[PDB]
Design a protein around this ligand. Structure first.
Ligand code: HEM
Ligand code: HEM
Ligand SMILES: Cc1cc(N)nc(C[C@@H]2CNC[C@@H]2OCCN[C@H](C)Cc2cccc(F)c2)c1
Ligand SMILES: Cc1cc(N)nc(C[C@@H]2CNC[C@@H]2OCCN[C@H](C)Cc2cccc(F)c2)c1
Ligand SMILES: C[C@H](O)[C@H](O)[C@H]1CNc2nc(N)[nH]c(=O)c2N1
Ligand SMILES: C[C@H](O)[C@H](O)[C@H]1CNc2nc(N)[nH]c(=O)c2N1
Ligand SMILES: [Zn+2]
Lengths: 403, 405
């Protein structure tokens, strides 16, 4: 019933009781574990998720069972019974957004969960207005390099009509331009979205780091194109503390990691556009973005610069260059005074979060394959920590590309 | 698509469906309410016979004789044996088959491209702790092959009803001692403090070093375990040095050549072999990263980074990452110099992807534990990191078993 959860470095043991409040099945069965898969394959129902949520909200502010709780539960019942849906009060939405972040099993950054600026954009009626809200968020979150976690919440889904959606997967991404020779200039992850921008009338650059425009979509309307003003997009040239030639690679990255394609579910309501941002953990940039073979794939170039023996795997030229590249990212961000966190500091803060959550809630849903960093896994303490993974609501969900 | 798990490689974009998981006859620890995939330990005639039948069917499938006279007669022979003794016995070739099948089925092993090349030593005649010793010594000699390592397994007698187990108390055939100091600290391998204490209790005169080879504690049925020292000429070791960092040799680090697991149960057709030590060769990260850098093992990261003169006072200098890479290279280099078979984590993972394709063709899937397959440094630098994996239990299997004390 209650899983035993052991840390193998320290020999300590906890029991997860939080998992009993999961209401939403994941992909594993007793016959086989699918825990490493990236994606998953009435009024009574909305009402009960709404009650549960309101219960969570009044509990959080310590007024469980009180007057304001009783009447707010009746407001929800009255609204759903009449309209098939209801609406959140702002402070509720703020609570839900933080709770969704808290509950996110793939997030190593959850120590910060209680510190989230929530912009309410549910009074948005157009893509123009979405653009304005998005520019505000970017300006806020960036704060001249002193990054600040934020979320902007656009209008919820409604049974009648199409969704508010942001087509881009992050507010800030680099174009990927397919070439005659089947090569890719820029970021291979963004070939499709680059091609869509072109198709909706963007004139493209030809660089390797062309900040993409936003395609924003109000209900049942074609998406519209909006060019981010280059002054709002904070970027960081990559140089390396000791390697002089590294800067001549002309590599760079943008400061603001801002997911724009995930759905935010609260009390059974669904927010199809709810972009959120915090700050990067360096391995995301240094290892995945620059070194993955299906991204910028720079490992070989770098190793050759460092004059390593590229001919054989056993010289560990890949591991050596991977580290220098991560070092360059950290150094460059620290130099440009932009918030960044290395994977040692992040995973250490995660362990503490585990401990806080154990005391507060009786556990913490966590996805081991995503929490453990993509280089130096076992050098981090999360590696030696068993984790229980399950779905709590409020939640972020992955959603289908709108096209 | 199909009603079976869809499996995606995110680097290449390729998709497969695992149909093999349908063959799984034992539940793991996951439910739809929660994934317990990252836990290291998760926890009569009728039951036996049906597991036996299934194994015999496996055996006849693999020789292409499903449905044949010999197949049905063997089945009939297995039921008659269980009808009259409550147990049964494998033919020699059935043991060879099931041993290899258990290795093939091991979700946590990245070395499985080799599954077909296993030397199976049949030791089911073994009848004393002294004879266990001889068998183990022969396995170690054969497997080590002066550095040209060869995969092998030695199978001692199976569990019997009311009769005690053959057991090897050591978790591996070669491990280093860990001595508890009056400092509180440990000299040697902290992983082995308990088994060390047990050896001294059963009469071992202990050493004083960081790399003292442990004696074997071997247990024949219903006897207390007996103590056996491996003659040093038998235990091949590799002194550690770095290709370019000249002072590394001066650290006096070393490791042994033969990774030989000895505490695992081998289950075949409901039969349980409590003592069937098996051995292969190392993947370099097991030594360079886990045994040498785990905080709860030798923990040498800081010492090495001090030698390398890194800034150990801040996390963002990536001093841990840099030292770990040099240690790992030291391991590879020293094994290659000494001409002892080793494989780096890149070659290993490349070859496992090749094994995945092979098994897809052969059996329609491959049970694999992503958290264990991905190496403990440089994860996403290896192709397995980008490969979804389905984990499930097939039989024949190796199981972990509770320490016999
Ligand atoms: C404050 C600094 C933060 C750090 C260092 C951080 C760190 C990370 C990392 C490393 C991942 C996995 C990244 C990947 O490989 O794709 C992740 C995932 C995630 N984080 Fe955070 N996070 C932060 C803030 C936030 C905030 C503000 C939110 C939302 C309010 C959030 C919600 C999520 C969610 C929903 C995922 C899963 C995304 C997916 O499945 O693609 N995190 N985080
Ligand atoms: C041929 C060279 C081999 C290589 C490179 C190799 C590699 C590995 C590695 C790296 C692990 C994970 C070890 C750990 O982190 O503790 C492992 C686990 C395992 N391997 Fe192999 N292997 C080889 C041969 C064998 C053989 C001959 C067998 C048995 C017939 C075997 C069966 C297993 C089993 C049962 C596990 C799981 C152990 C556990 O749960 O503690 N492998 N293998
Ligand atoms: C198909 C698919 C499914 C899924 N669940 N996630 C993804 C996103 C895939 C998963 N790894 C890479 C890609 O996204 C990049 C998202 N990473 C952001 C930057 C994380 C982050 C970091 C710091 C602060 C934040 F707010 C968010 C894709
Ligand atoms: C409690 C527990 C459970 C479990 N399943 N394994 C262990 C053993 C823990 C799990 N990782 C570290 C420790 O084992 C060392 C096993 N490693 C050997 C050397 C693997 C190996 C490699 C090459 C060839 C082989 F034949 C075997 C402990
Ligand atoms: C196949 C595998 O599940 C996939 O590559 C995952 C592994 N772990 C990860 N962990 C993080 N943080 N981000 C990722 O994208 C991934 N990718
Ligand atoms: C908690 C976690 O499951 C545990 O530390 C695992 C992770 N992956 C591993 N992978 C291998 N190959 N060996 C191990 O011992 C471990 N330890
Ligand atoms: Zn699972």
């Amino acid at each position: 019933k209650f899983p035993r959860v052991k840390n193998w470095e320290l020999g300590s043991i906890t029991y997860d009781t939080l998992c009993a409040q999961s209401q939403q099945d994941g992909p594993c069965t007793p016959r086989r574990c699918l825990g490493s898969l990236v994606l998953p394959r009435p009024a009574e129902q909305l009402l009960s998720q709404a009650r549960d949520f309101i219960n969570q909200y009044y509990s959080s502010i310590k007024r469980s069972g009180s007057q304001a709780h009783e009447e707010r539960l009746q407001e929800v019942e009255a609204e759903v019974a009449s309209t098939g849906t209801y609406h959140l009060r702002e402070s509720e939405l703020v609570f839900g957004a933080k709770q969704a972040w808290r509950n996110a099993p793939r997030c190593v950054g959850r120590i910060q969960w209680g510190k989230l600026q929530v912009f309410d954009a549910r009074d948005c009626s157009s893509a123009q207005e979405m653009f304005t809200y998005i520019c505000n968020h970017i300006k806020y979150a960036t704060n001249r390099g002193n990054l600040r976690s934020a979320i902007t919440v656009f209008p919820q889904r409604a049974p009648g009509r199409g969704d508010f959606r942001i087509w881009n997967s992050q507010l800030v991404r680099y174009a990927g331009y397919r070439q005659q020779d089947g090569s890719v200039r820029g970021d291979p992850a963004n070939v499709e979205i680059t091609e869509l921008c072109i198709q909706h009338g963007w004139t493209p650059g030809n660089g390797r780091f062309d900040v993409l425009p936003l395609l924003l979509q109000a209900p049942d309307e074609a998406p519209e194109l909006f060019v981010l003003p280059p002054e709002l997009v904070l970027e960081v040239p990559l140089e390396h503390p000791t390697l002089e030639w590294f800067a001549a690679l002309g590599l760079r990255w943008y400061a603001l990691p801002a997911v724009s394609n995930m759905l935010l579910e609260i009390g059974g309501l669904e927010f199809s556009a709810a972009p959120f941002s915090g700050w990067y953990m360096s391995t995301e940039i240094g290892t995945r973005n620059l070194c993955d073979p299906h991204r910028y794939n720079i490992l070989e170039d770098v190793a050759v610069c460092m004059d390593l023996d590229t001919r054989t795997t056993s010289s560990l030229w890949k591991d050596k260059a991977a580290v220098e590249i991560n070092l360059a990212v950290l150094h460059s961000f620290q130099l440009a005074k932009v918030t960044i966190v290395d994977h040692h500091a992040a995973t250490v803060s995660f362990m503490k979060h585990l401990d806080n959550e154990q005391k507060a809630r009786g556990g913490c849903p966590a996805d081991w394959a995503w929490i453990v960093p993509p280089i130096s896994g076992s050098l981090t303490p999360v590696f030696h920590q068993e984790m229980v993974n399950y779905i709590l609501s409020p939640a972020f969900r992955y959603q289908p590309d709108p096209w």
